[PDB]
Amino acid sequence: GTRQKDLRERAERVIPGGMYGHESTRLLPPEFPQFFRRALGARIWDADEQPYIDYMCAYGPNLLGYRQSEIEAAADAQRLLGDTMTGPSEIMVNLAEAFVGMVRHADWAMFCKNGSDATSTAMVLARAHTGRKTILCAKGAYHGASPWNTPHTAGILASDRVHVAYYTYNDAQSLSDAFKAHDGDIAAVFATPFRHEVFEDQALAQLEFARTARKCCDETGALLVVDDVRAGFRVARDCSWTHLGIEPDLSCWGKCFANGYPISALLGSNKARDAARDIFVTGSFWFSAVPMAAAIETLRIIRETPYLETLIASGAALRAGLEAQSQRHGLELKQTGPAQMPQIFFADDPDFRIGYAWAAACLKGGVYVHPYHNMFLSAAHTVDDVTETLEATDRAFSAVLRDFASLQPHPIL
Amino acid sequence: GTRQKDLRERAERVIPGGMYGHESTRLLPPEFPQFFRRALGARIWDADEQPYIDYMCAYGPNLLGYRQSEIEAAADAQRLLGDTMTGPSEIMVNLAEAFVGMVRHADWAMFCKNGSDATSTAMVLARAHTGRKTILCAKGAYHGASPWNTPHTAGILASDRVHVAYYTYNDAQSLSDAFKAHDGDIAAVFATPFRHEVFEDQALAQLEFARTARKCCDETGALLVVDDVRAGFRVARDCSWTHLGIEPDLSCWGKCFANGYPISALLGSNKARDAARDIFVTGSFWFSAVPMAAAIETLRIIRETPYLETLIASGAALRAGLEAQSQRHGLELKQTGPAQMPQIFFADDPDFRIGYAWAAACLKGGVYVHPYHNMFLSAAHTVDDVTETLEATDRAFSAVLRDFASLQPHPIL
Ligand SMILES: *Cc1c(COP(=O)(O)O)cnc(C)c1O
Ligand SMILES: [Mg+2]
Ligand SMILES: [Mg+2]
Q: In total, how many domains does chain B have?
């Protein structure tokens, strides 16, 4: 990787550590490229023009395929009109109508940039609404990288999160107890719609857990907040708890509802409308029309096409394939969570040395898979993509067995 | 008009209060349109296709003109390659090199979405760097709408800002005293490069204030942070304190350095590089290429063209024109701050009833000016635009004189 190497030398001079945040390759095998040149459909190309079938989907945003022609057409049409203007475009009204119409629990929407903006807004809203302090979150749940919730706490004060308290995800007793430990002071419960965290097996939400969240919120006046930034529109065409029959008061959305254009949302029921008006949240870029035009067209496609069934079928095929290959090579997998947003670990691999080696070996076959973070399917992944993926993964299992003696854990990890 | 009324009716249903944040027309005279259709150069068109010469410049981002063709071509070129991908584009390196090369105090850059992202990152970085808690800000200075700094505190806890302390802007003794009041506990000083706040006259930064900030930071090891999100690239082609001979440790940038594309930055010296690596900040959209391509082209135009001299000359002409005009009509204006980012109030107008009537009367003449928030000039405003503007302001001054006895203050204000 001549170009990659040049880019990494230069990057370290002018970017702290060469790169930062969730897309940094600091904790990945060294074979993983940091910098890319182009993307299309379900593929990315690194700086040295090596293609990869992309199972990160840009860490969520690529729902329908990179440079999907209908969304790029809608964005083009709005770009001729205006983007970041002295006021929002009229199409802000159309977007809020569309999004509110699709989400059964919601009567209103607010638009922002980052998913962290929507979760932070939900936190402040809930405190305004209830006049209480305590925000309940699941231990280890990722809701953004603000001082109140960032998972690494360099430069974070105890005071930044003194009124955040924790429960065990999928543990109805734990959540009940959390309500009583801060009796009378719960502003909100935040829940992701399933367990989707790094270095950990995924798990679907348990019905009893979700019901208890809704019932405790009901009995106390606390707001139920579903954080759908990650799973939104890959579980359902509505809030990801729709199939449990549990409606939140607020839901947070982002990543993929404009297929890569930067826009996030807070959706809320009429119960929370007054508090939403009382709080002050804004940003320079929150009223920009082009991301809103992309979102309108993405949401239309979500409503009008079998995008969801398509990307689930691709996910299921990959999962079945990997199960068969794992048995054949005698290397047991743990494929957890929904097949369309899979976590694919090795059984009995506590320092991840097997998973790391397998993921790196998949790069050589032109497949990008991730050894510690959940993956994603797009509606642009084809049957041929899955077939070619499985040829790469087959070779990767062989390469891991061939080298098995010499496998090492990642130093930094 | 008719379209505007329909949109406001529809907006109220699906958006809390029908709109929110800085771009809400809540506190403006009712003639101000909320929703727009298009923008080009120095003009915006509301939903009823009425054009205005725009002196808000989208509340800062429109530095070079809406849909500036060279920036749009650079954005097009990148859009054919890739935008939001599994990793950043190689052009992130080019951007960082360019921005670092232009900013004398800076050795590295980090990119995010919101200006609030950059200011929050600088806060967390300073705490990590120093191991101290206290952040010093000027009373009433706007640094974003995060829980630690948001100007309206519905849903905000005392604990959200218990380690933020305040000084009086442009009062060196006040700042020096705030250092001593938290002796050995100052992580950072934040300062905007001039006073630019709503409902208040603007004021340029005093040299002795800026030197005291630098010297107290030098003596204590606190980081000096200049918040250049609003003023950046309308004062200078570097950090807005360049002409005072004062270099900060960190500077925050946003709004206009990609001419409307959503991107913000934190620029830092090597002193702060280790802390920058230690903290965890990220966002789904922070590594998107197309705003970075727009930023590279905007920065080139900033370096290679007389854009700054152009918008300063336009601002200077408008200011001299309005001074002469107001005097002829027997009304005194208070035109404060740089001519290129002016606050234009009336003398002896404590409840803004005069300023509000005047601003409203300007709208009728195809001029968008703001009675409580600073305005902005773009390099796309021409001498003829200013000439046409002064014809409309003439009729506005006459309308104010005519209706003078019947002026009433804004209800909600
Ligand atoms: C607008 C502004 C910010 C915040 O930027 P957003 O993009 O709105 O989050 C920060 N500092 C100053 C001086 C500003 O004017
Ligand atoms: Mg609804
Ligand atoms: Mg420099």
A: 2
